[PDB]
Amino acid sequence: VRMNVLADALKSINNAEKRGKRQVLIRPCSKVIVRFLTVMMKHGYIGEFEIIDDHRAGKIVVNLTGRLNKCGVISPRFDVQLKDLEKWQNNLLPSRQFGFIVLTTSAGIMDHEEARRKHTGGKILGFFF
Amino acid sequence: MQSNAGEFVDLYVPRKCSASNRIIGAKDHASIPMNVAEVDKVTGRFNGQSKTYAICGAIRRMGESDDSILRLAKSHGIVSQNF
Amino acid sequence: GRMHAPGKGLSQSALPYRRSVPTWLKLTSDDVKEQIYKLAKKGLTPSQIGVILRDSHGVAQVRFVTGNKILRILKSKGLAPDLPEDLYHLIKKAVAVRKHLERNRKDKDAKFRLILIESRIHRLARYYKTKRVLPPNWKYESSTASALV
Amino acid sequence: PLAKDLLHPSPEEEKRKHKKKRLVQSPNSYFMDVKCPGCYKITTVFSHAQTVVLCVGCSTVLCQPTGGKARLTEGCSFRRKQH
Amino acid sequence: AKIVKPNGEKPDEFESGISQALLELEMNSDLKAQLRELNITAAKEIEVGGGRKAIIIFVPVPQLKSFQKIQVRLVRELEKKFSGKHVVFIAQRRILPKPTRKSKQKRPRSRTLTAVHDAILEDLVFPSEIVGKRIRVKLDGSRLIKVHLDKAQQNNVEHKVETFSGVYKKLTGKDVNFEFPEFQL
RNA sequence: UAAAGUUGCUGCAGUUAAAAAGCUCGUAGUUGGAUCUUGGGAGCGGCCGUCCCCUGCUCGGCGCCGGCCCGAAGCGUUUACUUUGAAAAAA
């Protein structure tokens, strides 16, 4: 069945980007999906998305640009210390110049670069470049 | 593509499809920069200034190249919003 | 897809966005509850009560008119039966199949469909035991399953 | 077509699409004011009735159950009601 | 008067003057039996955008549904008593904070942040019921809720839209726009 | 040992090269939908970025005319996670 909702959403916008679509519907809305997307938005990879409340799990429409090379999930949510975060960004990102690894910390769902600033490790959700 | 000093260091800045925002390689030979002529709105004649839309091969063989130029001209005030 | 079938059907109901009672319906929550009590005492199930209501008494959902759903309304008064109605119908179906197998021992496809109904009963049985609405020492016993109509 | 307005679909498109698959999930059923010619009063029948809908004291049978939208007895008028 | 605060504190003459106005509508006008039992908690005046004022009257939750039966007719009398002001009715809903590690019974989801903020939004507009919510996340990360209201009671409530945005902006801090979708219902 | 992504967690394979049980059920095992704190009050730098705040109940000290402001020991869901600290022989 559907088990990882964030996984479904990220692959859905990945398959939409590859085709060259201008906006994509991602059917189950979580909180973790919105946070991931806001983190991608703040680095300019996607445009202003919007969530659609039916009195259920909502849907999200994301306005895609052509900036997102790939948007991936890491399953399971491995638990990353600050020491390990370099070895994840070495084998999961193309360059050391661009690309991000979003991970849920106690502070909140944020990129590896903000996790280094705040001095807080956490569980990996996925990545985008 | 600055270094630490600020120097622009790469040897050419490649074009980028106006429809998909995906860069157009040195050997994507199905690309098309299409120039659309402008109009002196009172006369209806060629001015000399023109709008330039680039499209990558991928969208052209995808069959979406006309609808992309249709949106780009409508989003430029060439085609009527009505349409 | 389906549990014990290869079928992948998309046949469910679709509740409307607006949870508000409509303008036309004048029936008070009390009147609906008193009608639910009149239907339940007539020997009827929350599935059937919901149907009989939304057909000939123009009531979208009981949960929209009242604050609460139908089995909870039967439970709050004390009209809801001891074991749940969906587990009742599975046991009733299983008894009817196991009754069919008392004459037709060659019917290997009935025997296969019995093992599926058996599997669905044991599967609810363990669910209702976790939610503590069945006693833990309950058991689907095919000898005394016929005793329960 | 790449750029579909998924935010704002035309009503024709959502009326076409499956009830569950619409941008916002919406039922295709409805309630209707039905009256038989013998009795005064108007009973609210559900479109997809799936039961033999009787009037008060069985003046007549109103609605016979079918696959989908239940058939109303010949001589029974209906108005679908909305809010 | 009918101004019945849960705390042991007096109002201003503003809130007592509103309770006096609803005692006048009891004693003088026809809607007396359906206002005896009905009581009021608090009220406030807020500066809404432009040269307009928005008046908000809080209500107890169990009697709110009795207030729902008498809303728009009672709004008319306050609409002709206070000349250039828009009167709106919210239920004063008690709100519980999230139970933290640091900090007794289970927190009920009726008394939660989102349910109360959505019930407040539902009760801002009685003549119009909400037909769809669309939460735009703008490029700076800041949200903008878009409430789609019914075409039935459009003209009756359309002038109060510019008010409603400001009334919701005050209590929650959520920048809300209101639209009228035409094509579904 | 690397080369061996030829043991594959990173990271392999299984239509035809070696490879998916004949099929289904099924208990451990493994993995499991959405949903329950948010908007602000205050200051600095040139609308934005970092900073301070959104639990109560014995004895004391910034004290005041039994109470209030403040500190100390204790009581205050359970973990996992992460961060810090203690500790951990040398070679």
UniProtKB/Swiss-Prot annotation, chain A:
SUPFAM superfamilies: Ribosomal protein S8
GO cellular component entries: cytosolic ribosome; nucleolus; ribonucleoprotein complex
Gene: RPS15A
GO molecular function, one term: structural constituent of ribosome
Physiological role: Component of the small ribosomal subunit. Part of the small subunit (SSU) processome, first precursor of the small eukaryotic ribosomal subunit. During the assembly of the SSU processome in the nucleolus, many ribosome biogenesis factors, an RNA chaperone and ribosomal proteins associate with the nascent pre-rRNA and work in concert to generate RNA folding, modifications, rearrangements and cleavage as well as targeted degradation of pre-ribosomal RNA by the RNA exosome. Required for proper erythropoiesis.
Positions where N6-succinyllysine occurs in the chain: K87
Subcellular location: Cytoplasm; Nucleus, Nucleolus
Annotated protein name in UniProt: Small ribosomal subunit protein uS8
Family as reported in the entry's similarity comment: Belongs to the universal ribosomal protein uS8 family.
InterPro entries (alphabetical): Ribosomal_uS8, Ribosomal_uS8_CS, Ribosomal_uS8_sf
Single biological process term from Gene Ontology: translation
Main localisation: cytoplasm
Pfam families: Ribosomal_S8
Keyword annotations from UniProtKB, A to Z: Cytoplasm, Nucleus, Ribonucleoprotein, Ribosomal protein
Membrane spanning stretches: none
Subunit structure: Component of the 40S ribosomal subunit. Part of the small subunit (SSU) processome, composed of more than 70 proteins and the RNA chaperone small nucleolar RNA (snoRNA) U3.
Lineage start: Eukaryota, Metazoa, Chordata, Craniata, Vertebrata
PANTHER family linked to this entry: 40S RIBOSOMAL PROTEIN S15A
Organism in which the protein naturally occurs: Oryctolagus cuniculus
From Swiss-Prot, chain B:
Cross-link Glycyl lysine isopeptide (Lys-Gly) (interchain with G-Cter in SUMO2), where in sequence: K41
Modified positions (N-acetylmethionine) in chain numbering: M1
Pfam families: Ribosomal_S21e
GO molecular function: structural constituent of ribosome
Gene3D superfamilies assigned to the protein according to its UniProt record, in alphabetical order: 3.30.1230.20
GO cellular component terms listed in the entry, alphabetical order: cytosolic ribosome; ribonucleoprotein complex; rough endoplasmic reticulum
Superkingdom, natural source: Eukaryota
GO biological process assignments: translation
PROSITE patterns: RIBOSOMAL_S21E
InterPro entries linked: Ribosomal_eS21, Ribosomal_eS21_CS, Ribosomal_eS21_sf
Subcellular location: Cytoplasm, Cytosol; Cytoplasm; Rough endoplasmic reticulum
Keywords attached to this entry: Acetylation, Cytoplasm, Endoplasmic reticulum, Isopeptide bond, Ribonucleoprotein, Ribosomal protein, Ubl conjugation
Function summary: Component of the small ribosomal subunit. The ribosome is a large ribonucleoprotein complex responsible for the synthesis of proteins in the cell.
Oligomeric and partner information: Component of the 40S small ribosomal subunit.
Protein name as it appears in the record: Small ribosomal subunit protein eS21
From Swiss-Prot, chain D:
Gene Ontology biological process: ribosomal small subunit biogenesis; rRNA processing; translation
Cofactor binding notes: Binds 1 zinc ion per subunit.
Major subcellular location class: cytoplasm
Keyword set includes Phosphoprotein: yes
Cofactor: Zn(2+)
Domain of life: Eukaryota
Similarity-based family: Belongs to the eukaryotic ribosomal protein eS27 family.
Protein name: Small ribosomal subunit protein eS27
Primary gene name: RPS27
From Swiss-Prot, chain E:
Post-translational modification: Phosphorylated by NEK6. Ubiquitinated. Deubiquitinated by DESI2, leading to its stabilization.
Glycyl lysine isopeptide (Lys-Gly) (interchain with G-Cter in SUMO2), cross-linked positions: K65, K69
InterPro entries: Ribosomal_eS7 (IPR000554), Ribosomal_eS7_CS (IPR047861)
Residues bearing PTM N6-acetyllysine: K69
GO cellular component, one term: cytosolic small ribosomal subunit
MF (Gene Ontology): structural constituent of ribosome
Gene Ontology annotations of biological process type: ribosomal small subunit biogenesis; rRNA processing; translation
UniProt function note: Component of the small ribosomal subunit. The ribosome is a large ribonucleoprotein complex responsible for the synthesis of proteins in the cell. Required for rRNA maturation. Part of the small subunit (SSU) processome, first precursor of the small eukaryotic ribosomal subunit.
Protein name: Small ribosomal subunit protein eS7
Organism phylogeny: Eukaryota, Metazoa, Chordata, Craniata, Vertebrata
Annotated gene: RPS7
